[PDB]
Amino acid sequence: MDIKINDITLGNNSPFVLFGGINVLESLDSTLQTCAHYVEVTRKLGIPYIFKASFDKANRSSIHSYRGVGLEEGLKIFEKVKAEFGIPVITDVHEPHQCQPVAEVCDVIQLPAALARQTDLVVAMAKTGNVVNIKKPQFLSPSQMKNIVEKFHEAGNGKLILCERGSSFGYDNLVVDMLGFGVMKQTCGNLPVIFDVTHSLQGRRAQALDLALAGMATRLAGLFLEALPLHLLEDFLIRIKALDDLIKSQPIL
C-alpha cells in the first residue's frame, strides 16, 4: 500500500524517500540553512525529500539540555520551511494534547519508540487522520508491529509508516535484522517501511553506508537519517540512489 504525502508517493515499490534534517529545532536561520542544503542536494539527484526535526526532545542527555524551541515556535518554523521550500515535514509528538496542533501543520507525525504502546497517544494520533510514522522499539520483534498497526486501524487510521531502528543485542549494542523488513511487510499489509540507519548505529561513514545499502537492498520505501556530516550528503545519496534505482527497477517475482 502506498501513501501520498502531497506530491510524493511513499511505498515499498516506489523510489526511496529521504527523511532527514536536524535533531532539535534551535533557530529559524540555522534550520532554513540546513534544510536548504538537503533540498538542493535532493533536487539535483531527483530524490523525494521530507524535512525532519524535533521541537520538543523528550529524552535529553541531561535534564536542562535545551528541549528545542517548543510547540508554538516549532510549528512556526515548520510553516516557514513548508512555505520556503514546498516540501513535507515530519516531527514527533509526546502527548495526546500535542497531536491536533502538530498535525494541522506537519505532514507526518511520529510516534516515539518509547511511547509506541501508550494507547492514549496512539488513539489521539490516529484521530488526527494524519500520516503516522511508527518508530519500532528496539526490544519489540517485527511480528509485534502488527499489534500496533491493529490499534491504529481500530482507531480509524491506516496511513501508517513503519520505521526500523535496530534490535537490542546483548548490552548496549544494536543489530539490524535484515529479515525483519520482510516480516513487517508480510504481516502489516505491505505498509511503507523505512529505515532509520542513524539510530541503528550506536570510520562511522563507511558503517552508515554499508548498513544503509544493506537495508535498501531489501526493497524499502525510504531512508531516515540524522551523525552524517552535511557536505558528504551528496556522495552518500548518490550511492543509495544507485542501489535503490537498481533494486526498484527489477520486478519482485
Chain residues that interact with its own copies, rule: CB under 8 A: 58-65, 67, 94-95, 114-120, 122-123, 137-139, 141-144, 147, 150-151, 154-155, 167-173, 175-179, 181-182, 186, 201, 206-207, 210-211, 213-219, 239, 242-243, 246-247, 250, 253
Does the protein bind Na ion through residue 161 (CB under 5 A)?
no
Residues 117-146 that bind Na ion (CB under 5 A): 130
Residue 90 CB, shortest distance to Na ion, in Å, is 10
Closer by beta carbon to its own copies, 8 or else 165? 165
Q: Which of 22, 103, 124, 184 contacts Na ion by CB under 5 A?
A: 103
Half-sphere exposure of residue 16: CA atoms within 13 angstroms, side-chain side: 33
Please report, for residues 56, 58, 138, the alpha-carbon distance to residue 62 in angstroms, rounded to integers and kept in the order given: 14, 11, 22
- How many C-beta atoms lie closer than 10 Å to residue 233's C-beta? 18
Amino acid identity, position 87: I
- Residues 18, 21, 23, 25: what is their CA dihedral angle, to the nearest 10 degrees? -140
Binders of Na ion: how many residues, by CB under 5 A?
Answer: 2
- Residue 68's region, left for phi above 0, alpha for psi from -120 to 50, else beta, is left
Closer by beta carbon to its own copies, 43 or else 60? 60
The number of helices, as runs of H, and strands, as runs of E, in the chain is 8, 12
Does the protein bind Na ion through residue 99 (CB under 5 A)?
no
Contacts to Na ion by CB under 5 A: 103, 130
